[PDB]
């Protein structure tokens, strides 16, 4: 199978291709394009035109419909979708079935939705001559949105930005990960198919430095940079993008925590740490990989984590009763075991877990690695403190209320925290206290699109969701009228 | 006059000292203490603390009583501000006693304000269990904002950001331009007399790079910079917060057009071209540099022009009559004259100014300029397409409406646009379709403190006032609730 | 047997019919089985059962989803409700089919999407204990709307009621107009088709006072009341549902004025009004039957509009070319013309029209009258300040702006007014000082479904449209929670 | 004591007063001068008249500024408010400084504000001929407001209505309960005092049917009618503005539950039923006169709650650590004592009170009752369906969530609710079902004014409350530009 790029309405290939590899089995499962900084420059001198063209006279009415005709053309082809992510992934086939594809619709869907709703200010002022003035908003498309996501939910991550990008009628030129570009790509089939005018989507394969996003990155020709990754990576993309003074939006990823207090639902909270740790492999930026307990539930409850975690089937998507797929890669399964070892070297307990499982098959040469569970490290060390990215948590004790809201907030990354309490007023107090952009309370993971979605220090800048997309995507400007 | 630094509760002073020069005739004003690098870092710590002190106990309603009577204080020694904001930057007095200070005042009671009737949002769903949830959305203190401000409106420009940072929770850490610290060290003391917890504000004085505001940009305890300046430093701040991932907020530089349709009212349009082009010097981000006139009104135009601008009183802040200060500083004199220059050299012709008055008196030891109109060059020429910052504009004839939209956004900068037309469809159509963030039509520099202030491209990034300060200014949390 | 109730998820006869007649011809095209009492007692009480059922347990997202369908079977039987409507109203066709069921579907499309997207608010407090409340607000159903239609625009005006009604979770117990019952009975069809839960939909047929109208009103199972129509009746109204204190929404009579001045594009405000005046036969509560001229184009407005209103065709709904068609019923033909008698006697000059067309065949057993225009008539005659709500203006000179205002002003009414003219600060000056609820300026009815819609004075009472329908249709909670 | 209507900027008698009785000793305090038809007249038309006045000129910001002079008054006057109040109604002098008099000057203070802050909305829109068209908003005064006040929160329910009326920049004709006359007055002096121009505010006394009440409802010069009082009443006035069809926003009668589960903090939740059953002598329409708890607990928290009600003090309102004044009046004793009787009848356990205290001085003169609780009715009874408003409550047991939700919606009434629990779900799952505008969680009367404020069914029909306020009290304008 082969990947090409997608620009000014042509599918083209490039002067160098790369492998895409299934991480079920180590197989090779196509050969992607790698733009060059000719072919970026190419996309997005072709996206800067289109906003001229068709696309930029259609009504707010006929776009929405043309993006819910998007939306459409994904549901009409689910199952080559779900087929095209669990093979680059390895996700189970039940969650990309459950959780992925119907996101990526529900991404277009809402944001076409908001694009017709959405409706801007008046301001009415006095001035000196007794006239007046009035001062009222619109918003415009922003320009050409720059688009670099990550592999972890590639059509989720990837369409919750390209859909309030194109809603708000700007035009796209999107980067997807080097290890998850095939959803992307049907995608772009999809744009054509729709009739989507040429050069309004524009899709890029490659990697990061000295290739397709760092080309994207170092072009003057965008008006944004939206970004879901590594913090780091995050800091080099607001570097590069400086000099011009691109508008930029991060969703950074960090280190969050998991609290759960004496009042709790124990079971609740047991089967809410499994689902909040493991999913995906622990694959997720909003994933716990600390987890405080009151001490006076903390044995009966790491017991019971055990218990299930130990229960969850490792496999092959199609698998029966399948809980976790393996890792993105092997590369991403060097540095999480690379952690399971400093977790070791630490001091940590290993309460499960701490290697990779044994299949004697295909999947010996995949990247799986086991769901884990540590104990008795210090706030200070390590595996507590950095992100990992892997099915892994460390569960730790506490007493008081104000010493774990500050055990939590004692991080340089702020993104989610869930709370586990049935008490009332513990609920509102603890999370207005939390130093993050997303409390759950009693659950995880749940999404309203409408909800500005974002983190604090480390774990970002800015917020996307509802109308905070809506405002990031668009040219906000201010007429004032003297009477 | 000796102009000390504010850090926790305490004026002090520094190792090292600067002088404030006086550009109406080249003397000394004052010494200004400047922060070192350790300085800084205690501000920085002092402002980080204060968030867990009293000021942070106190209910929105007491933390907006207290903001109001830091403005009563201001309004207390109205004239103490005016002489300080005079003193600094020559600007005439009448200015200063309806523009400058004016504002500054209404710019801590529109934000005491906002403090008390913003809201937040709830946003309800439903769930597989059908249980549903609740998502709520708070606004929090983001935490220590660094202020970093301009010479050009000083004590309004410093507490455009300062009001709403305080408004909002956060403590503060400001750093006044080195060319005019007298109204902010001014603005301590009204703090420090009503009695704002130590900390809260710290007002710290110095030079940008290897100085004290390179050092503020440095430090990793602060949670936002906002700076309004040039774009070239914007950049520069871009880059040094980066690797924190900071939240940003810039005002940068303009190189802004009126334009002067054949429908206008004449005499309106020249009068009002006059104010937009050399207003305070021309030494305003939303002057107009750039002007364009329909054909068949140009040579009246021009001729009008010529006429009001030669009748313009270049001369002392408390002098009859006086329309026009010096620039701010013999320094950025230079960089004016070295355009001056320039402007002969690309071809212009000099329809009126293009020196420095002569006064025979203590001024000529000042930093004065005349005000200027060139006619006759190119859209590509240097002179037409930089950021002078200077009492300067360019005036070229168009013939139609969608050529001239064309040449005021073929620009690397877009922050303002004035519009002149006495035509409804006219000023709606057209005023959409210019890329800035500001139109004004049939007026200039309207300031409605509710609108979303800002520009696109190298003009920006983000936006402020109203609501958009609200949310810049503060952490957005959400909250989710399973049921 | 044609037109039957349907409640409760059937569709019943009565003990009593009564005749719909074709105004084209009068001939008789259905009998309508009149509710009574008891039916009307029935359908109540569905409908609060049915809050209690399946919809009331629908999550937003279905039920948008229904509704969206309920659009979708309007659009697979487009050409059965024109017919419907047409043969009802004798609209001409291709009204029929841009206007009105366009609108019918647009109407449910609008309202289904805002049920996605609407959201309520969030508002934090501090307390004396230190620990704080929150409040936070949702819409929920009112219960059971009470919707009252007028024959007019019959689809249009009775989905938008039905349509918001549905959308915020309500259940309906709905009246047409005796003299439109078709294209509300397909609806039902349509309705029964999609499969909305019995109860939840619910029509009824019949008149006013003594009959399905009045009883509607008087139930107590309602929980409000909307209403468009004369104002005289919206009084009724008000005082039968004021011992339950039932929420209302009026929107009701007006004599509506369009002024030109000197400065507008004179045949773009011909064309204006001749449109205000007789679309729809002058049957719309937006219609002018008041214009006011600058005296410097009167002669000139006149004479252009009396040879454009020659120019209209009179006659059938599939009739080629056709602009006019009759009136509602021979009974309103006979108020028309009892007005077109009254203006004469109170000295109108009849510059045109001022009776019936004679057709020489069956036409001449329907409804028709001419298109009409007046001159000459005082600010105080009847046929001046009294809604007739047939095809017909008087125009009256003025010389002065505030004049002009004063006249407009000075009504019973308030509903709509038309301003034309080019001039900038004139179009915002004057419309905002016309006291009404919808001002058009170079325009007439065009609808932004997201707007506030209503009136002053006697035109009615509260505002739909948009949030303002979401509010109406739903009941405000408060909940405020103590920590 | 001599209390005058105020009318065009004049104090004036009238031909007939009445008395202003001292409920706690039965003595005259003032002869009050009652408005007959001619005199509402003369209020109207100077209101009217008012709007075209140098009110009508004041821009926003100076509306404003002059509402805050009208609250300063107040607050210079801070304590002979608290007398006025006091002497009509024998509310406990502490009530009146830390509830009633601070709260009428936040009602000033809220709403100058939100004037200030509350912008409107812009709409864009897509034509058939591709130019476009916009639509915006705005708030005007709504023109003359009518305001009729109850006795039980003299001046907060007046303030409430005229504030907001005020800052929306109308004028007003006010009339307070014949009952409580003397703050209205004061605040007509203050009125005065600061310059608010003649015409602007009207006090009017007397009484409803035959006298100034029923003559402002009547009158045609009138735009709306706000009330707060008895539901009969707001039936009566709904159907004598009808004709007129006036805007009208009522908050009315309410039989309020108090519900507690057996997760209750069963001491602050008996503290929190006795505020809410007593306070101001139960005289409060969101005071709770039913009572459910949890059968598990009910037996411990009647006992609990016997005890606290048998330690209030009734007495003298400067009275050392008096609960509970008098009632406002001899007839209403009347009413709530012939209830005392029926609650017998009815079959009622005298828990506690049911009769009158014997004082043995001058409050035996007065208009006291004991506060009473009831056991033993059923859901049916007089006594717990009606509302009585005094000091009562009877209270229930109940078994199931469903169940005690149900019985809590079984009422003709819908006001407020308040829920005793510390179930983070229970709070939240239970507090949407309760079919009322205002819920309480763990609290009573905890007030932001920022919320929307009002009541279903017989309790009242629109809100008020922040945006809700200034949408009634506005004529909301679109106003539509064809570009
Ligand atoms: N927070 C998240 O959701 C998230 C997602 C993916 C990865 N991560 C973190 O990052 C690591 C893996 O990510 P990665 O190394 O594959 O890439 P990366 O996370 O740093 O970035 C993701 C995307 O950015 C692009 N990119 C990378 N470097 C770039 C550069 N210099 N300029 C422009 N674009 C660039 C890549 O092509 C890729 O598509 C993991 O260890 C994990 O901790 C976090
Ligand atoms: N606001 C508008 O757009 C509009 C629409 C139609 C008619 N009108 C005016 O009304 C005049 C008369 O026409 P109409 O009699 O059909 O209008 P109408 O307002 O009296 O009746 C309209 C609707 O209300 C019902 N109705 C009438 N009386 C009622 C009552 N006492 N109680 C409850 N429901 C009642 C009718 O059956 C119908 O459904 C027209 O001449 C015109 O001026 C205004
Ligand atoms: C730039 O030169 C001026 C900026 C002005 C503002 O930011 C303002 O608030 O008016
Ligand atoms: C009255 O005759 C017209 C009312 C129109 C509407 O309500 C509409 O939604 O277009
Ligand atoms: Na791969
Ligand atoms: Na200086
Ligand atoms: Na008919
Ligand atoms: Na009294």
């Excluded at 090409?4 to 895409?20: M, P, Q, R």
């Excluded at 009504?59 to 087929?83: C, M, N, P, T, Y």
């Excluded at 744009?191 to 524009?202: E, K, Q, R």
Aim: hydrophobic share 40%; glycine share 10%; charged share 20%.
């Amino acid at each position: 199978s082969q990947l090409l790029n997608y620009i000014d309405g042509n599918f083209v290939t490039s002067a160098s291709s790369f492998a895409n590899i299934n991480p079920v089995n180590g197989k090779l499962i196509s050969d992607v394009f790698e733009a060059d900084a000719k072919q970026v420059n190419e996309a997005v001198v072709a996206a800067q035109n289109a906003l001229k063209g068709p696309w930029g006279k259609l009504s707010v009415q006929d776009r929405a419909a043309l993006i819910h005709k998007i939306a459409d053309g994904i549901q009409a082809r689910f199952e080559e979708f779900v087929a095209a992510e669990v093979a680059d992934t390895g996700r189970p086939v039940h969650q990309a079935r459950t959780l992925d594809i119907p996101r990526a619709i529900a991404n277009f869907r809402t944001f076409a939705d908001l694009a017709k709703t959405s409706h801007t200010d008046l301001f009415e002022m006095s001035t000196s001559d007794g006239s007046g003035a009035l001062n009222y908003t619109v918003r415009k498309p922003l320009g050409v949105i720059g688009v670099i996501s990550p592999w972890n939910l590639p059509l989720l991550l990837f369409t919750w930005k390209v859909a309030p990008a194109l809603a708000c009628g700007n035009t796209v030129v999107a980067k997807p990960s080097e290890e998850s570009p095939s959803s992307a790509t049907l995608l772009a089939e999809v744009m054509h198919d729709a009739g989507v005018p040429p050069g309004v989507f524009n899709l890029i394969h490659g990697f990061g430095k000295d290739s397709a996003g760092e080309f994207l990155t170092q072009h003057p020709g965008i008006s944004a940079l939206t970004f879901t990754g590594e913090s780091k990576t995050g800091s080099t993309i607001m570097k590069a993008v400086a000099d011009g003074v691109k508008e930029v939006s991060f969703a950074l990823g960090g280190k969050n925590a998991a609290v759960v207090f004496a009042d709790a639902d124990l079971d609740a909270a047991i089967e809410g740490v499994l689902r909040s740790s493991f999913t995906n492999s622990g694959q997720v930026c909003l994933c716990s990989e600390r987890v405080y307990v009151h001490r006076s539930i903390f044995d009966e409850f790491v017991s019971g984590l055990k218990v299930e975690a130990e229960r969850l089937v490792v496999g092959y998507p199609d698998q029966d009763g399948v809980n976790m797929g393996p890792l993105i890669s092997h590369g991403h399964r060097d540095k999480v075991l690379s952690y399971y070892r400093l977790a070791v070297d630490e001091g940590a307990t290993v309460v499960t877990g701490g290697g990779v499982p044994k299949f004697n098959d295909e999947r010996d040469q995949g990247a799986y690695v086991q769901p884990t569970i540590w104990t008795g490290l210090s706030d200070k060390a390590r595996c507590v403190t950095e992100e990992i990215f892997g099915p892994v948590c460390h569960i730790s004790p506490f007493d008081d209320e104000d010493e774990v809201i500050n055990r939590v907030n004692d991080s340089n990354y702020g993104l989610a925290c869930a709370i586990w309490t049935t008490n009332l007023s513990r609920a509102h107090r603890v999370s207005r206290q939390i130093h993050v952009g997303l409390v759950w309370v009693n659950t995880w993971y749940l999404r309203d699109l409408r909800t500005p979605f974002g983190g604090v220090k480390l774990s970002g800048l800015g917020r996307e969701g509802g109308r905070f997309s809506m405002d990031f995507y668009s040219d906000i400007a201010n007429i004032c009228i003297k009477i």
